[PDB]
Paper text:
The HIV-1 surface-exposed functional Env spike is the sole virally encoded target for broadly neutralizing antibodies (bNAbs). Most cross-conserved sites on the Env spike are occluded by host-derived N-glycans that appear as “self” and sterically limit naive B cell recognition of the underlying polypeptide surface. Functional gaps in the contiguous glycan shield are the protein surfaces of the receptor CD4 binding site (CD4bs) and conserved residues proximal to the furin cleavage site at the Env interface. From the Δglycan-primed rabbit displaying the broadest and most potent neutralizing responses, we isolated two vaccine-elicited bNAbs (vax-bNabs), E70 and 1C2, directed to two distinct sites of Env vulnerability.
The other isolated vax-bNAb, 1C2, is directed to the gp120:gp41 interface and is a very broad mAb elicited by repeated vaccination with the liposome-presented cleavage-independent trimers. The high-resolution crystal structure of 1C2 Fab was used as a starting model. Analysis against a 40-virus panel revealed moderate potency but greater breadth than E70, with 85% of the viruses neutralized. Further analysis revealed that 1C2 bound to gp140 but not gp120. To pinpoint 1C2 binding specificity, we performed nsEM using 1C2 Fab in complex with the 16055 NFL TD CC+ trimer, which indicated the gp120:gp41 interface as the target. As observed for both JRFL and BG505 viruses, greater apparent neutralization activity was detected at 24 h compared to 1 or 6 h for 1C2, 3BC176, and 3BC315, whereas the activity remained relatively unchanged for PGV04 and T20 (fusion inhibitor). Together, these data implicate 1C2 as having a similar Env destabilizing activity as 3BC315 and 3BC176. In sum, the vaccine-elicited rabbit bNAb 1C2 shares many similarities with the infection-elicited human bNAbs 3BC315/3BC176 but achieves greater neutralization breadth.
Numbering used by the authors:
A (entry chain H): 2 to 35, 35A, 36 to 54, 56 to 82, 82A, 82B, 83 to 100, 100A, ...
B (entry chain L): 2 to 95, 95A, 95B, 95C, 95D, 96 to 210
């Protein structure tokens, strides 16, 4: 059984956004406290709240500005209001099992199932598709036996972009570095690959419904 | 409630042993869990109820402690263990909610030393027309960490540099690093020699190109 979060999007400061957590291969039942958990870029995990799948429990910093609900036996939602840049993060949904106290309380036993997460980006900028440029050794050099080529994926918003090589058949020797956020708020990354004897980087930017294929060759 | 993990970063040679600590601001008995997170992946449960191992986790991971002080001991560390580890405690009721992750502890796994190969990439021909130009330099498969310096006609650059480092390789403990220099189209045509120096202690490697060629 699995969980998948959906709804992450780029939104302006002040907006509201609803995320959904859909269960597959099981249903939300009376043994499940479904929790939301988030992680800002490069920071630690932060518990948001949980809903009993058979009434809600929020962290003190969240209570009063966001809501967790159960729509079905397969879906729970996170309704967030007055978003700010401090809410830019990955939002995971986790299936919790509890150990009851006997006095009316419950202790979180474990989160044994996590969705892959959805990205919420809070910014005033508009979505922007990346510019893709080939990375090749300078033309005024003597080519060698082997060569490393790549693609620069520059100036996009929001995350993420995905990068494959030759539509996924080329994997050995590929380094795709973590995205970096520039001063302007836009993101950039590069992907390099090593080969001997052309090659094509495939860049997908879901949030602008864009896919770019750049065929890279060494320049003589 | 507050979960304080000290220290925030630990290191050990492959095969050695590390201990991550988690302190609780109150007495929490035994309801403590440990989690492992690698970049880009959700967290994965390692231990719960202080010491019970989760389905599929090796015995090299060991829970400990009670009350206010707990610890996670990793024996026989491998490069695949390089990651961030979080403690977690949670209590809910109709009147009091006590939930909290620890701040996390990063584990750097020391492997075999490796010097970096370096590559420089001049800007594609279609960059300059955009008013901005980006030069990429890559440091491949290395350990321990490196530092990168950018020189444009012998003048060390200090603005417009972004560096990005992969996580440690699952089998190799090694890193890869990209270092990007961004200039204006005018700035880039104004100079000629562009050079990237990667320093790993006493050793260093330098790559360069000249705009004209």
């Amino acid at each position: 059984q699995s969980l998948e979060e959906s709804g992450g999007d780029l939104v302006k400061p002040g907006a509201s956004l609803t995320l959904t957590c859909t269960a597959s291969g099981f249903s939300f039942g009376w043994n499940d406290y479904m929790s939301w958990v988030r992680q800002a870029p490069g920071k630690g995990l932060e518990w948001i709240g949980c809903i009993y799948a058979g009434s809600t429990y929020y962290a003190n910093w969240a209570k009063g500005r966001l809501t967790i609900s159960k729509t079905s036996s397969t879906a729970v939602t996170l309704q967030m209001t007055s978003l700010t840049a401090a809410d830019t993060a990955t939002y995971f949904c986790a299936r919790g099992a509890v150990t009851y106290d006997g006095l009316g309380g419950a202790y979180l036993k474990h989160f044994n199932l996590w969705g892959p997460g959805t990205l919420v980006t809070v910014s005033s900028g508009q979505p922007k598709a990346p510019s893709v440029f080939p990375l090749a050794p300078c033309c005024g050099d003597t080519p060698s036996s082997t060569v490393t080529l790549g693609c620069l994926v520059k100036g996009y918003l929001p995350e993420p972009v995905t990068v494959t090589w030759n539509s996924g058949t080329l994997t050995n020797g590929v380094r795709t570095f973590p995205s970096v956020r520039q001063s302007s708020g836009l993101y950039s990354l590069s992907s390099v690959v090593s080969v001997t004897s052309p090659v094509t980087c495939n860049v997908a930017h879901p949030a602008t419904n864009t896919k770019v294929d750049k065929t890279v060759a060494p320049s003589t | 409630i507050k979960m304080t993990q000290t220290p925030s970063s630990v290191s050990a040679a492959v095969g050695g042993t590390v201990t991550v600590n988690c302190r609780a601001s109150e007495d929490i008995e035994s309801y403590l869990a440990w989690y492992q997170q690698k970049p880009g992946q959700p967290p994965k449960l390692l231990i719960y109820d202080t010491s019970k191992l989760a389905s599929g986790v090796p015995s090299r991971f060991k829970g400990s402690g009670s009350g206010t002080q707990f610890a996670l001991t990793i024996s026989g560390v491998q490069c695949d263990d390089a990651a961030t580890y979080y403690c977690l405690y949670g209590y809910i009721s109709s009147d009091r909610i006590d939930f909290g992750f620890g701040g996390g502890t990063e584990l750097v796994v020391k492997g075999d030393p490796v010097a970096p190969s370096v590559l420089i990439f001049p800007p594609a021909a279609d960059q300059v027309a955009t008013g901005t130009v980006t030069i990429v330099c890559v440091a491949n498969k290395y350990f321990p960490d490196v530092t990168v310096t950018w020189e444009v006609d012998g003048t060390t650059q200090t603005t417009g540099i972004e560096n990005s480092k992969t996580p440690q390789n699952s089998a190799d403990c090694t890193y890869n690093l990209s270092s990007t220099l961004t200039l204006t189209s005018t700035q880039y045509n104004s100079h000629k020699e562009y050079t990237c120096k990667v320093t790993q202690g006493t050793t260093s490697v330098v790559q360069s190109f000249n705009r004209g060629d």
